[PDB]
Amino acid sequence: DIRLVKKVGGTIDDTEMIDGVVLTQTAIKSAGGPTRKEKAKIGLIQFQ
Amino acid sequence: VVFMNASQERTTGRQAQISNITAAKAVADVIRTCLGPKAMLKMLLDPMGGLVLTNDGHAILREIDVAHPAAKSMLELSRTQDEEVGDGTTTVIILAGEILAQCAPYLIEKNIHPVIIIQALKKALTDALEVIKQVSKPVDVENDAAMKKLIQASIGTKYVIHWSEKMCELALDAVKTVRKDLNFEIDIKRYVRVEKIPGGDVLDSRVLKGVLLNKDVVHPKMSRHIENPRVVLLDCPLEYKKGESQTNIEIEKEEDWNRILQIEEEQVQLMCEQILAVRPTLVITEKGVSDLAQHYLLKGGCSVLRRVKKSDNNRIARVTGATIVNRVEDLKESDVGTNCGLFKVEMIGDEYFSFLDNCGLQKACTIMLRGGSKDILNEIDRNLQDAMAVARNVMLSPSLSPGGGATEMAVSVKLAEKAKQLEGIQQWPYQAVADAMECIPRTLIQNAGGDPIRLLSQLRAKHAQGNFTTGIDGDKGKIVDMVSYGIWEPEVIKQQSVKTAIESACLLLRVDDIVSGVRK
Amino acid sequence: QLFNNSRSDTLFLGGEKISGDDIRNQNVLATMAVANVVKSSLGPVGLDKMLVDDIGDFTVTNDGATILSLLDVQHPAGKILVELAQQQDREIGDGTTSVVIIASELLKRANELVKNKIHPTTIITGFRVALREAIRFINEVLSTSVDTLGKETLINIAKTSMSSKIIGADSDFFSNMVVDALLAVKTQNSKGEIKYPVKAVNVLKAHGKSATESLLVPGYALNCTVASQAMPKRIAGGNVKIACLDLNLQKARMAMGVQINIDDPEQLEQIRKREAGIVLERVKKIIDAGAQVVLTTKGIDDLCLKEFVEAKIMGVRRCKKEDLRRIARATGATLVSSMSNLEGEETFESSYLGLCDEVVQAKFSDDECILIKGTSKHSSSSIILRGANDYSLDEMERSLHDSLSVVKRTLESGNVVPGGGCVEAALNIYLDNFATTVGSREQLAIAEFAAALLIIPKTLAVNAAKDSSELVAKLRSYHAASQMAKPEKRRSYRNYGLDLIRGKIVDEIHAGVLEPTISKVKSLKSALEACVAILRIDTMITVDPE
Amino acid sequence: AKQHENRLEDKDLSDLEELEDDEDEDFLEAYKIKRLNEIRKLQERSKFGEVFHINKPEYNKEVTLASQGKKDDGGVYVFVHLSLQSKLQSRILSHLFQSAACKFREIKFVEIPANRAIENYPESNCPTLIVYYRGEVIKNMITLLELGGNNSKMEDFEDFMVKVGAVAEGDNRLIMNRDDEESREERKLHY
């Protein structure tokens, strides 16, 4: 339940507990429609 | 425990600069005798085996692989000068070498910093463009008689000065054809075609406005002489195009296999009928042609030529005004080319040649050069590239300057006086720029066989009187004014030379360490 | 150093074993061996270098970012400085040459503290209290960004980034270029936060006239060739529509599954026609929309080129993904991956097209570039660099690319500080009085930390081939009086540094050289974190490859 | 020396027609008849083209007899796949067989479940790729970690077929040699 995500960059002093679940992977940016979301409903797709 | 796979040892300090400046002097020594009208020729042995006989600076440097990395900055200046203008390549190398050779005994002797020299060259370059603007003047661009002597200036160094009366008319008609109205002269060398035909005589030549193809007609019934031809350009093959989807037809009945080959004949029949919808007389295609399609075009007299290059189709389009259309359905009377004439196929035993001639201001032509060997055809072909290269700048800008060492001497006489005013530390390298312009006049004199110490001594006193058009003759070595003879070049060649020479010196003077072994 | 140690005496390791102060000395020589190539490249008086790849190819480079990346070092202690040079290029984009020299001297000057039986834990603690005391002093000595009635700042910021380059003499001309470029490509995000995307401007490798006559484009310049030669090159008139497509426009097959199997051969030609027709129906509606200029990521087949030549449309193949987002962002269009909508029908709307004033294709020394200028919705910019050859322009490309990052930071953070080793000399006077207050063993750590910071102004004089102690002693004298300034402006003897072209100490504000304070912050922490990584190592265990 | 050989060796029957106007007819058509005969041999050898989902009694014939072919040593390569639907690599390798089957019709592509192949063979061991030729096992390949594992691609599978002698190096059907038409189009323009 305690995941340690390694991101190369910055300094150790910037390390702080994130309130929510941080994702390691980046976005696709093939279309690049949305920029910043607010009050979003998250879903987990397992199919293709 | 080497700590470095790429040259853990180092050659630092002043010894790296000795290797740099001495290498910059060596590349100029092998082409010092390649200037002036009495210049000699060179031969290069490429590893592929194709020999070439060259005197232009760009062809010498590009075919010589050099192991010294600091020298390679000098090798690329003729490449930069070639693509920008195409004339005056040799002056950039020797001028850059004299600037580096004259600036050598200042870090060794005076211990002046390089960055102070960088400031000195920019102020000298600023004054160099100022006095070149003062020495230059405008002339009339539309006078065809005036354009002949300007094209003859660059031709005088090359071998074809003996045919300068023919070469000026050969190049002047060609550059005016591709020229159009609209940087006010947007025509490009890519539109100009030059086909090299071994054999013949260089005196017999003409500027034909067309596209010379190097192949024969595909069927013997076709007439090789058309009075009023009609050109139609195509990209689709006359053969049956195979689909990239991969399909399997399973034939279980009996009439299906016969109907497929009948549909193949019906498709070529329907395809050829749409070609005849606008009843052309000459068809051009960049792909193959089936033997089935040749028969149906005999009734219409549509002469077909196949496997034509993509660039040649564009050159055919600009001459005849035809539009390149892939599909055969979109053929209209406007798509068909017009105002073409004199379609004739001259029989030569080597290869078949077909001519074209005219009666959307972009135009093109094909200069058919005749000679005695394929290597000297490349020489005359490169002289044609130099013949039109000097003509573009006089057409682009009306500005014009003298040459033959006079314009370079005018920079030194003005710059020496400016150094005399300069007063400080930067005045020591500022004097080196004034002394660096003396190599060109000197080189010309030395090649001519004169005594440069006394010829240039009186030239200093001659320019001190207040004249700028006084140069040095290349044959006998007089101090006669160039207004009588007519040695004149554009201003863009000398502007690009002093700019590229100064900018190349700034690149190479700021190097202190040499390393290798990276293997990127 | 002297001799090789015994190989696994009663230890039974397959590799090598070494311990003691010998490896600690090897790390110092390792950091100094890789730092010597960075020494001569520091400051405006530094000279460039060239790296040969043993294939004839060479590249001229001044900054230590890509030099150390190209130099393949096998010692792992040197790899941290190699990655430190690459790390500083990503975040800050300037000062890669300084962190290597600062990190090497902190380890070199701390090497004397090792044999004094001072533990490294006490040494780094004395360095860290000196660090946070130095950051607060940097936060006190910083200045505002107004300074006068006019701006008079961004032109001077470019000179610091442009110094020590081949075009440092032409920085007066290029200073106006970089400030006009980044002010055109600004954006809006996070409800009022302004951003400046670095590398968004197009740096073209052109050859020709000179670096002084480099014309600034008032708009984006696409580096690609025209498909056909019979097309119109110049398109005049206002409100030129820009179409940005990415779907596959050349003739392609049906999907993997579909296998055309035919029994009645009559429709075999019809399926061939519709496969050739279905790709032209897309081109038909673009002509109905009236897009003068169309750009495609993928190729363009000859079946599509005939329609563009007939209708006088500018079709360009072989575009890249990252470019077309900036074209659509600048010209006001939107990126179209495929033509469809929420409804079942398929069509194309005119709202997807952009707008620009003029589009002209220009060629200069075998470099065809499409000049798109006059974007209505948002402005754009591109810089056409001109020089001797491509390898000389790579130094200019890195010189411009580092200049955008420095001018990015002074606008994101208005706080700046003067160059010429001013803050490096000011921290020494501040830390000497603080070193005596703390008392115990950390005095030597804080003191030697301050002595290592003086290497930046010393290297400016050593590479200048002048007397260094006189300039350092005069810079020491003025900074010594700054702490004892006796406030009541008359707070003088501050904000001074070295002037190398004349060899005097003058005011850096009037001279016109500045640097953002955030570069000093991240460089000091990243240099000390690298120093912590090397000091804490005791014994090496090198395992040979199987 | 190679410049004369590249005219004929580096051009198929479709590409040899480019030199019809340039080169001599007798020099060109003499080689086109040779290359045309080679194309006819591949059509006669195209006895396959889809994955043969077999069962064991048959293995003793399909896998091995085929490997003998005409037995003129007309050998035939037979790629067997001990499939296991629970494993992720097995379904990837099944897709590569059908893709390669549509291209290489002369090579036989065989598939069978691994549980039905060998008595109590470890489930972990499969996906197993065996290559028979003239009755002899040329390669007993283990799970696809050698071929990238989960990230296996069609290019890696075609490269393996060249190593075992199933496909020639300079074959026009291989993706390494089958350059795109847009690639060759740019070469002619920049030439």
Ligand SMILES: Nc1ncnc2c1ncn2[C@@H]1O[C@H](COP(=O)(O)OP(=O)(O)O)[C@@H](O)[C@H]1O
């Ligand atoms: N007969 C001549 N008399 C005086 N000067 C000449 C004569 N022929 C050539 N020159 C000078 O030599 C120069 C040679 O130019 P050119 O051969 O076109 O390129 P490059 O200068 O690179 O050799 C010209 O600029 C011209 O001023």
Ligand SMILES: Nc1ncnc2c1ncn2[C@@H]1O[C@H](COP(=O)(O)OP(=O)(O)O)[C@@H](O)[C@H]1O
């Ligand atoms: N004109 C100048 N006068 C005095 N010092 C300068 C000048 N230009 C740069 N410097 C000094 O050089 C240091 C590093 O310069 P920088 O531009 O980062 O070099 P590089 O571009 O090679 O990384 C700065 O800390 C600054 O103090």
Ligand SMILES: [Mg+2]
């Ligand atoms: Mg010349």
Ligand SMILES: [Mg+2]
């Ligand atoms: Mg910098």
